[PDB]
Subunit: 236 residues, 4 copies
Amino acid sequence: MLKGKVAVVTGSTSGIGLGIATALAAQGADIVLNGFGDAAEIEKVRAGLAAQHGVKVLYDGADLSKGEAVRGLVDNAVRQMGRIDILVNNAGIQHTALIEDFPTEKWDAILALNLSAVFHGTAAALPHMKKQGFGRIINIASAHGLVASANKSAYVAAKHGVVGFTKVTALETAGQGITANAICPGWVRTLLSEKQPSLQFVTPEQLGGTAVFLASDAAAQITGTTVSVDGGWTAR
Amino acid sequence: MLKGKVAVVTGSTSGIGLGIATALAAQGADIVLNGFGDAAEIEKVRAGLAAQHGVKVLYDGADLSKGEAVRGLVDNAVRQMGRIDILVNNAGIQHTALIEDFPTEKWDAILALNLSAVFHGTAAALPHMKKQGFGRIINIASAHGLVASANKSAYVAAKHGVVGFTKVTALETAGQGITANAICPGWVRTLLSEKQPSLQFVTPEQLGGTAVFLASDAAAQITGTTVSVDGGWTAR
Amino acid sequence: MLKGKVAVVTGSTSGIGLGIATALAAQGADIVLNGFGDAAEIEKVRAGLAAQHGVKVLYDGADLSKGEAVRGLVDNAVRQMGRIDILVNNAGIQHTALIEDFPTEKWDAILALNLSAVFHGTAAALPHMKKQGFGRIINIASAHGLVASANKSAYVAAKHGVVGFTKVTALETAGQGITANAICPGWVRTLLSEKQPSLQFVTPEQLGGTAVFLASDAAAQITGTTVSVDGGWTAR
Amino acid sequence: MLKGKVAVVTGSTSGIGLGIATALAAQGADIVLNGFGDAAEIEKVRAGLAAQHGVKVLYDGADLSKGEAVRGLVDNAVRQMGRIDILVNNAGIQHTALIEDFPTEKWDAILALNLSAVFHGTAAALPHMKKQGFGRIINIASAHGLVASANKSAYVAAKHGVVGFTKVTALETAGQGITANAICPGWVRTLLSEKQPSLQFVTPEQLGGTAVFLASDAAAQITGTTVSVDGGWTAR
Ligand SMILES: NC(=O)c1ccc[n+]([C@@H]2O[C@H](COP(=O)([O-])OP(=O)(O)OC[C@H]3O[C@@H](n4cnc5c(N)ncnc54)[C@H](O)[C@@H]3O)[C@@H](O)[C@H]2O)c1
Ligand SMILES: NC(=O)c1ccc[n+]([C@@H]2O[C@H](COP(=O)([O-])OP(=O)(O)OC[C@H]3O[C@@H](n4cnc5c(N)ncnc54)[C@H](O)[C@@H]3O)[C@@H](O)[C@H]2O)c1
Ligand SMILES: NC(=O)c1ccc[n+]([C@@H]2O[C@H](COP(=O)([O-])OP(=O)(O)OC[C@H]3O[C@@H](n4cnc5c(N)ncnc54)[C@H](O)[C@@H]3O)[C@@H](O)[C@H]2O)c1
Ligand SMILES: NC(=O)c1ccc[n+]([C@@H]2O[C@H](COP(=O)([O-])OP(=O)(O)OC[C@H]3O[C@@H](n4cnc5c(N)ncnc54)[C@H](O)[C@@H]3O)[C@@H](O)[C@H]2O)c1
Ligand SMILES: C[As](C)(=O)[O-]
Ligand SMILES: C[As](C)(=O)[O-]
Ligand SMILES: C[As](C)(=O)[O-]
Ligand SMILES: C[As](C)(=O)[O-]
Ligand SMILES: [Mg+2]
Ligand SMILES: [Mg+2]
Ligand SMILES: [Mg+2]
Ligand SMILES: [Mg+2]
């Protein structure tokens, strides 16, 4: 279980992020939700999770495309929750186009959220985790952080960047009770034959369970690595 | 939990294998122990695990250096336990020497146990897992299945072979309710500064927890991949 | 040889880039130099290369930290040289610091030059290479595009990004007479015991020879991959 | 060029091996051919290469499935040629079948030739290369030494083993004027849409050129790595 621990999950108002926040809440961890969406429905989700799992759940709608906002998300999480044991950098966007047709605006946006937000969030969380003597940074990369697909240059570059950044985070925190790993999902229903051998989608629940495992003490020495949840995508 | 499931763990009379068998037993899975060692003490371990976790535990001392013996281990596990849901190919040996000084006898022995035994065990288990519609093959490779170290040619070659074999197993079983993955441990106290950034040993308990996770339904789409538990070894 | 071909090498006013531009010039390719430095001495280098190898050599001091300037470098190379057969994205910078102490300004600068410049340059060159039916994009990444080192978060993230971007470039151009690969150097004298097994530095001349090989017809089917020139860095 | 150097290429009576031996001969290196086939036609090939390139070419039909025969091939190469600067471990076989249907005889044969022969050959060559202060071991692995395909368990395991063994060889010889690398080819016409993005076959000539490059001084610091020549196979 994760009772007494605080988890911040970026982009948890829906999809994979919500699945991960839900799984962590079920383990007894207090949660800080984040992401865009309908204010009224987000409040329903927040209140629902808190009541269903008997944990404290807050919502911070910080726009993670801005570095100071990402750092602020972490700062306020610590101020209101008292600490930050788990940081799940999940928020992300995408865009398909040939490299020569790829809008610079889209390239910049994808790198800002999919990669730089991981840097800013990690930077703000580390001082706390080092002092606490405990930390779990779980970055949601992609199979595209390990291999590529045509027409997804910005996304693949950003995700590969996340994988590298994860490794550095791990090396800088090695032995300090902190681990940093990157979950690399294949397709999630948030087509299969071309990339996913199992011909089965990965689910937010499975990814939540994977995050829960990485947050456990059994994973104390799992650091600076990738955990592929892709139905065989990267095996071939 | 894993109630109603049967797990065969090779080389589980001590070290990592025993830790994995213990973790699986604690989840409610019936266990088939295997490996060399003292008959009287092995019986004590077997009886102890069965009583402590309320599961059926058997011991088969098959010499896995012989292909037919490995296949026999699986055949008898099914005959006595009724099925084989989880196969942990863990038994292994090592030998240090420069390539030009490496005894052919040692090269052959390491490949036979560290690599070929995985093939024979997997081959015998697959028909059952495919019919059952459920299977979890967990191969204990090593950080040396991904990177190398001087003077460990046979071991590194064998472990890399296991990683490749694991990927093939996954592709051949994709979507059939079966997964095949390779846990790649760093140092386990069964020196650290040179290879393991955390400067902390990996434990049999942690590896057992990792095996338990891979055996869970949350890991249904984790297949054909490696899970490094090495304190940062492969991150640098 | 590369007679009749045009090569643009970013950051070729010194170090690795100059070594690569020199090697390509020796193969008979026309060259477009680029980078910061002393105008008078750069002219001496430019004039020297042209006279020594009997090829056309131009210099464009475009500041590659700006996307439009990178695209302009390629546009003008085509206008003055008539085409662009080889694009070597080499310019890069670095900065050491713990993640929590890493200046956002430095993070942004490193990503802009080490990663985004590869995108902008590649984007501008592709239309030409596709029409020509020939292209060689050679990205100078680093061993740090495959593994990490503590205190180099921005650099490692950017270099990993380059590796991923290289793979996408290759997939989008597959079969069109164009290849895209990433040379990943270890230490170059532009300390060794910790990362480089050979205990020998990699030289600009060796990297130039590696670029020459990738530009050759023998490397027509080498695409979307990395070529490590690191004295064993990534083997362990 | 490679004048004054001796190269031994296993399985060079046809296909990739012959292409590599031919390329090396064109660089001025003396050659030792090896492999099965028609004695009369092999002699024609041998005599032809020697006359066409003005180098010494011998043929040794050692059956590399036997360790002592592999070591003998190297021993006799040194006795008749005076030294062994380049060793290309290329001979290999294959077999397709599901793991549970894979004949143990075929599994053993593939491991013996595709993997163990690399060990025996390397072991016999190393003492000479270390004394000479120069060595180039070029192992012909496959894309299947890095990724897998269903129904090729023995081959994939063996090729992954070769990649690992190559890394160890490099680490044990680091800085001694010796390098060890593994060329990993995609399809060679010795179907494409499923695995090879370029939709173009790799040729023996291209692989020969790749071997020539690795044998050059420019590749002095390229060691313990893989060089994929696969038209994009491993990029996705
Ligand atoms: N869906 C897949 O197949 C898949 C598989 C591999 C990896 N991933 C990764 O999973 C992560 C989550 O994506 P998803 O598939 O669940 O999609 P999603 O749209 O369901 O979730 C993305 C979340 O990001 C938040 N978000 C977007 N921009 C933001 C910003 N500027 N600031 C703050 N929050 C922002 C959204 O509000 C949303 O909650 C992404 O990083 C994605 O790249 C997805
Ligand atoms: N200890 C580490 O640092 C470490 C880290 C990476 C991977 N590994 C892998 O973990 C596995 C277990 O090794 P360990 O470290 O627990 O050592 P160990 O000696 O404690 O356990 C090895 C087990 O293998 C069994 N065994 C040996 N030969 C056998 C044979 N011919 N037939 C049947 N059983 C046989 C033994 O009886 C024993 O129970 C090995 O595959 C090893 O390569 C070890
Ligand atoms: N030196 C090493 O050990 C090593 C090994 C791995 C990879 N690399 C990579 O090699 C590449 C070249 O670096 P180097 O080691 O030769 O260093 P260097 O300083 O000798 O060369 C860098 C070049 O980049 C140019 N440059 C810098 N900023 C620029 C800008 N904004 N616009 C245009 N040009 C700019 C410089 O003028 C210079 O010619 C870099 O991408 C680096 O990351 C270096
Ligand atoms: N053809 C491809 O698509 C491809 C791509 C990836 C890697 N490879 C590798 O390339 C290598 C060469 O195979 P190829 O495709 O040129 O096939 P090939 O049949 O044309 O060549 C194989 C060579 O191995 C020799 N050989 C076989 N068994 C032997 C033994 N017991 N002793 C001595 N020599 C023996 C043969 O006589 C022959 O010259 C193999 O290792 C193969 O796995 C092939
Ligand atoms: C949505 As995806 C598989 O490109 O990360
Ligand atoms: C015992 As080990 C780290 O070589 O697998
Ligand atoms: C200068 As480096 C080895 O960090 O790329
Ligand atoms: C002949 As092959 C591509 O399996 O090495
Ligand atoms: Mg509303
Ligand atoms: Mg006794
Ligand atoms: Mg001046
Ligand atoms: Mg005849």
